[PDB]
Amino acid sequence: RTRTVNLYGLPAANPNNGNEYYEISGRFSLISLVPTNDDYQTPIMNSV
Amino acid sequence: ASLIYRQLLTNSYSVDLYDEIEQIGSGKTQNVTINPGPFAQTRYAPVNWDHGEINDS
């Protein structure tokens, strides 16, 4: 009941569209720099 | 007086007790044996500087 009709986009009035959530799936590749040792720097009696 | 040397040789076993005593007396340390294999130093990344996220409207 208004001028602006047939416009492409998505207004903020009701974005949820009655849905609890919008979901997305994917893969997650991380190349972080751990502090982890290499089993050295550990005392000489490092054993059962 | 020749028996000094015989006596020292025969009684030499007491040096084990002496070694135990000095071992108990001495303070102690130890090692954390070092790692080899820093054969590949690693640079940060290919990094490029730019302005942040401008908030347009």
DSSP string, A1-48: --S--S--S--SSSSSTT-S------------------S-SS-TT---
Cβ–Cβ of A41/B34 closer than 8 Å?
yes
Resolution in A: 3.5
Which of helix, strand or coil describes residue B40?
coil
Experimental determination technique: cryo-EM
Contact call for A44 and B31, based on CB within 8 A: yes
What's the full length of chain B, in residues?
57
Q: Is the torsion defined by CA of B46, B49, B55, B56 positive or negative?
A: negative
What are φ and ψ of residue A36, in 5° steps? Answer: -65, 140
